[PDB]
């Protein structure tokens, strides 16, 4: 629909025989967004996952699982 | 408009086209490209820039083309100097976007309204920087058309003049903005507005006044605001109100009639409050025809019954991660249309039996992480809806018989991390009592977990009652040995029994005439009792019921005993599994393996002259090895030696024997192994005695001549019997028995 | 020592492979949120081989 946009906790840059497409952090160790309400404790970090080679970008609570 | 086939064109700036959109990026061959467009048809595009002065959106891609699309987004770009940014879209060949989201840390300057000339016809507008900057009130001029606005600047006061032309506003998010107060005059320009986004902020003092004209408001988000306290009529003018948030704020107390003028409410949410709020007003919620969810974590202490009083709608509550020692009874009196309470995290020790009483819908229930004690026989006895429940890492010690009887709705039931026994008293047990777990009638339950409590056994209606028992948790209970019998599960559902680290040290399993089992981790003693479980581990015994149950053993070790140990039960082979006997005669070590009923006597002191008093054989029993190696016996016992009658083998090698009697030899006799003897010479009464017998005969000073022609016939013919004929020897010179003839020692 | 929005389940199959568990579900802690953003984990590819799933906070233009 119209104005459809979707918010993700941490912000990334979705990049480029053959080339392979890859997301990576914005920052390193930035604070999430919208990160307010989870508890004093978890701090809230954003971190870079890969597949070596970087695959996305996921924030992160201390917690157990 | 903007295709493959465009992309494919040069050289410009280079377009690839990836999963179902396209990469442009100018220049084509620039390590951090100026820019770097990503193209999805008739959806989006995002311009994502790197630029250091404002002339570089000449390297921008000339005529492109990239027709209608609802959603623009630029991120770390130039603000365009005096040039309106619609220029720019213009540029690209963009038309009529409904969203603009401009998002830079880059700007070079500040947001001016000249920036948004021709982008008056926008739905959706996001401007967002965290660069030092300042917004002009003029900004939002002529912006009939916003419906959704986002800005986040770290602003620090906004002037009522900039809502002016946003009549059709319905939502506005401010978090992460510098508000220490609410612009006033403000909801009167903005009659259609419904969600008001103030989080992260600091919106300290708030107060009635601050909302008068916001009948219009449904949602207000004002979490992370370090409120304090609040008025008890903030918001008395938002009447028609009906999602609150005060999270992550300072309350140490709230005033009663808080939401008295805002009948309206479906979800409050009071989540995770900076400090210590001790409890909740009378009445906070009472007298709400219309509240559903809730979710309150402030590290309460305590609750009023009548927090909730008349409020017959509430679906679901988040009491999780707080303090509460226990409830009051009447607190969920009301609540018929409750669907999940929520107590995890708390120091709950007791529920009053009539807490759960009227909650007759009741879904999911959650308790675990508390200290609860143990299950009554009315704390459920009308959870008949009740479909999925938790009491993990508690303290339950006594779950009552009739704990379990309503609740047929039941499916999923975790207990795990508890003390709880059944307390069953284990002779019980050992004489197979037909007696049910206080879970018995619930047949249709798929999901028990009793991890890490201390069962020890298999109920009975665990196998025959849950015929549907899907999942099986019994890890890490005190379960000390199994019976063919404890593995007999009626469940036609794909039931997975867990059974690791116990204290299962036997499994008795007999030679006889789809569940699966892990039995890994488990202080399982390997002798003679566990023989026919060796056998089933491997292709070897498959005994009927074998095929109807699947055994996970992949880590099952021996502990004892210290021969076997740290081996494998796939591994093993079964003639190892001796169970020693303690009667055995002095000097002489013992045991006995069921593979082969061969009851094993080793007497290797090197200090008999007589054979010792030998221990019966059972009537069960069908090998024994008199095993006297390397020792220095004389004469051997008569055949109806009691003990020694029994003698299936008798290994005597090494020892000084000078003459063996066909009466000295046992009647079930099989093996005969004098080897390295005294031996001289054998009659011919013995000769026909050995007629299957395998024979040793090597190592005797053989006197071969005429009497010894028997002997010499004997070897001749029974080859098979006798390992080495070719190392027997005579003694008229030494020459191989086997080398001499009925007539070199005959005249 | 760490816990994310949308739980998923890595693989390695032939290259090493993130993967949603419940795409199109509610993510974990879906209330911790602000309020007009409703949390949905997505499955995110790369090059198609599921390379990440995380939490998507979207916003309808609708309440
Ligand atoms: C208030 O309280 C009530 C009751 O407690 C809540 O209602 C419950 O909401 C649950 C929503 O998650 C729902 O549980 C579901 O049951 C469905 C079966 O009918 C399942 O399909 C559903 O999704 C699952 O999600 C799993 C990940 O968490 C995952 O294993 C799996 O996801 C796969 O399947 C989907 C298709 O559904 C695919 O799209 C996806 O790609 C995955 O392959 C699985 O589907 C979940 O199990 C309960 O039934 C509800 N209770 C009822 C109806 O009584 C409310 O949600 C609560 N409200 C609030 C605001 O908290
Ligand atoms: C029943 O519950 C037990 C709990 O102890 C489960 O045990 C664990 O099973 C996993 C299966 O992968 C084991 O993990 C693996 O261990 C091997 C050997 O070290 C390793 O090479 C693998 O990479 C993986 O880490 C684990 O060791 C094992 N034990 C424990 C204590 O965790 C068991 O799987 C459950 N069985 C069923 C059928 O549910
Ligand atoms: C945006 O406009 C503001 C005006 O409010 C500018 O603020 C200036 O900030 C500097 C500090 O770096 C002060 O020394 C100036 O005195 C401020 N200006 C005034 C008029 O007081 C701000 O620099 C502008 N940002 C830009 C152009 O990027
Ligand atoms: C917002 O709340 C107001 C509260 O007064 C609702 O006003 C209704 O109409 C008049 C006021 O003009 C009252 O006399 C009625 O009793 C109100 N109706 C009720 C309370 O049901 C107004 O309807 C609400 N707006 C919306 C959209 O629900
Ligand atoms: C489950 O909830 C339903 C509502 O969906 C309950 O139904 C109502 O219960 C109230 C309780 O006082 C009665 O006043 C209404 O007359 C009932 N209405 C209907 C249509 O049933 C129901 O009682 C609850 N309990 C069970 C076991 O379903
Ligand atoms: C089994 O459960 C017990 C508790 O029921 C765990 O023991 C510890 O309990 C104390 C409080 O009584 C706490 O330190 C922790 O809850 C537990 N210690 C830990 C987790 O290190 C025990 O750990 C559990 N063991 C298994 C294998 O589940
Ligand atoms: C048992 O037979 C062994 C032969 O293997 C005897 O051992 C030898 O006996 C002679 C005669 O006394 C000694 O000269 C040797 O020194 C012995 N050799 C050894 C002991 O290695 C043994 O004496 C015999 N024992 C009995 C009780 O008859
Ligand atoms: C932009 O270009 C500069 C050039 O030095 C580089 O350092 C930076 O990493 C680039 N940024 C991006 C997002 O590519
Ligand atoms: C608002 O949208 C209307 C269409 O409903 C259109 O005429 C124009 O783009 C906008 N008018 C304004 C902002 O005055
Ligand atoms: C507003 O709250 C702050 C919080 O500390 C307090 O210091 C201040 O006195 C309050 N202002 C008024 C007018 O009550
Ligand atoms: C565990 O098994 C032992 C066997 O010696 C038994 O005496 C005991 O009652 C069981 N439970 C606990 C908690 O020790
Ligand atoms: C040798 O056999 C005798 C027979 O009773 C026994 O007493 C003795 O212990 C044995 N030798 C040793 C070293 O034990």
Not at chain 2, 24 to 50: G, H, S
Request: aromatic content about 6%; proline content about 5%; glycine content about 4%.
């Amino acid at each position: 629909v119209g104005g459809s946009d979707e918010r993700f906790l941490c912000r990334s840059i979705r990049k480029l025989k053959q080339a392979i497409q890859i997301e990576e952090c914005e920052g390193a160790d930035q604070p999430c967004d919208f990160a307010a309400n989870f508890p004093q404790s978890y701090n809230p970090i954003c971190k870079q996952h890969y597949t070596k080679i970087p695959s996305c970008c996921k924030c992160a609570l201390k917690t157990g699982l | 408009s903007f295709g493959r086939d465009a992309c494919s064109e040069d050289g410009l700036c280079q377009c690839a086209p990836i999963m179902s959109e396209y990469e442009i990026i100018c220049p084509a061959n620039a390590e951090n490209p100026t820019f770097r467009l990503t193209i999805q048809p008739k959806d989006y595009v995002q311009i994502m820039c790197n630029l250091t002065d404002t002339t570089d959106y000449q390297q921008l891609p000339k005529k492109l083309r990239i027709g209608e699309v609802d959603r623009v987004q630029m991120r770390r770009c130039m603000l365009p100097g005096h040039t309106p940014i619609a220029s720019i879209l213009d540029y690209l060949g963009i038309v009529s976007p409904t969203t603009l989201i401009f998002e830079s840390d880059n700007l070079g300057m500040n947001i001016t309204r000249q920036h948004l000339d021709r982008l008056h016809g926008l739905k959706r507008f996001r401007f967002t920087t965290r660069r030092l900057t300042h917004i002009p009130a003029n900004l939002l001029t002529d912006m009939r058309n916003l419906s959704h606005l986002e800005l986040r600047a770290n602003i620090e006061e906004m002037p009522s003049h900039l809502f002016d032309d946003l009549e059709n506003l319905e939502s506005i998010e401010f978090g992460s903005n510098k508000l220490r107060q609410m612009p006033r005059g403000i909801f009167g320009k903005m009659p259609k507005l419904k969600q008001l986004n103030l989080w992260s902020n600091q919106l300290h003092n708030l107060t009635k006044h601050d909302f008068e004209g916001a009948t219009s408001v449904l949602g207000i988000d004002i979490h992370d605001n370090g409120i304090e306290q609040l008025p008890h009529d903030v918001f008395a003018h938002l009447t028609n109100v009906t999602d609150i948030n005060l999270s992550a704020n300072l309350f140490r107390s709230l005033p009663q009639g808080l939401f008295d003028h805002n009948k309206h409410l479906n979800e409050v949410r009071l989540m995770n409050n900076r400090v210590p709020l001790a409890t909740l007003p009378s009445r906070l919620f009472a007298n709400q025809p219309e509240l559903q969810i809730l979710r309150l974590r402030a590290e309460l202490q305590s609750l009023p019954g009548d927090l909730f009083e008349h409020s017959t709608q509430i679906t679901n509550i988040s009491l999780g991660d707080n303090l509460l020692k226990t409830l009051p009874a009447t607190l969920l009196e009301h609540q018929v249309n409750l669907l999940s309470l929520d107590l995890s995290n708390n120091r709950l020790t007791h529920l009053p039996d009539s807490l759960f009483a009227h909650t007759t819908n009741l879904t999911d229930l959650r308790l675990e992480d508390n200290l609860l004690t143990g299950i009554s026989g009315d704390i459920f006895s009308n959870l008949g809806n009740l479909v999925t429940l938790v009491m993990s890492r508690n303290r339950l010690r006594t779950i009552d018989s009739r704990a379990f009887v309503s609740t047929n709705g039941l499916r999923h039931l975790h207990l795990d991390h508890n003390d709880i026994d059944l307390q069953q008293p284990l002779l019980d047990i050992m004489l197979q009592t037909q007696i049910n777990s206080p879970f018995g009638y619930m047949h249709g339950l798929l999901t028990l977990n009793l991890r890490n409590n201390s069962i020890i056994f298999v109920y009975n209606d665990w196998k025959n009652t849950m015929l549907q028992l899907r999942e099986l948790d019994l890890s890490y209970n005190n379960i000390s040995s199994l019976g063919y019998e404890d593995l007999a599960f009626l469940s036609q559902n794909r039931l997975h029994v867990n059974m690791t680290h116990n204290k299962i040290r036997r499994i008795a399993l007999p030679e006889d005439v789809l569940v699966h089992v892990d039995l890994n981790d488990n202080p399982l003693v390997c002798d003679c009792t566990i023989l026919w479980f060796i056998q089933l581990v491997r292709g070897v015994h498959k005994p009927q019921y074998s095929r109807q149950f699947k055994l996970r053993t992949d880590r099952l070790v021996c502990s004892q005993p210290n021969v076997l140990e740290g081996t494998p039960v796939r591994q093993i082979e079964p003639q190892t599994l001796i169970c020693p006997l303690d009667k055995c005669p002095r000097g002489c070590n013992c045991h006995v393996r069921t593979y082969d009923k061969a009851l094993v006597i080793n007497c290797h002191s090197g200090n008999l002259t007589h054979v010792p008093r030998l221990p019966n054989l059972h009537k069960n029993m069908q090998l024994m090895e008199l095993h006297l190696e390397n020792n220095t016996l004389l004469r051997l016992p008569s055949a109806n030696t009691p003990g020694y009658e029994s003698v299936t083998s008798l290994h005597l090698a090494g020892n000084n024997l000078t003459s063996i009697d066909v009466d000295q030899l046992p009647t079930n006799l099989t093996h005969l192994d004098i080897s390295w003897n005294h031996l001289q010479m054998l009659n011919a009464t013995v000769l026909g005695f050995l007629n299957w017998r395998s024979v040793k005969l090597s190592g005797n000073p053989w006197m071969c001549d005429c009497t010894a022609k028997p002997l010499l016939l004997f070897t001749q013919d029974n080859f098979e019997r006798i390992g080495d004929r070719n190392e027997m020897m005579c003694v008229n010179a030494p020459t191989r028995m086997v080398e001499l003839s009925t007539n070199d020692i005959c005249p």
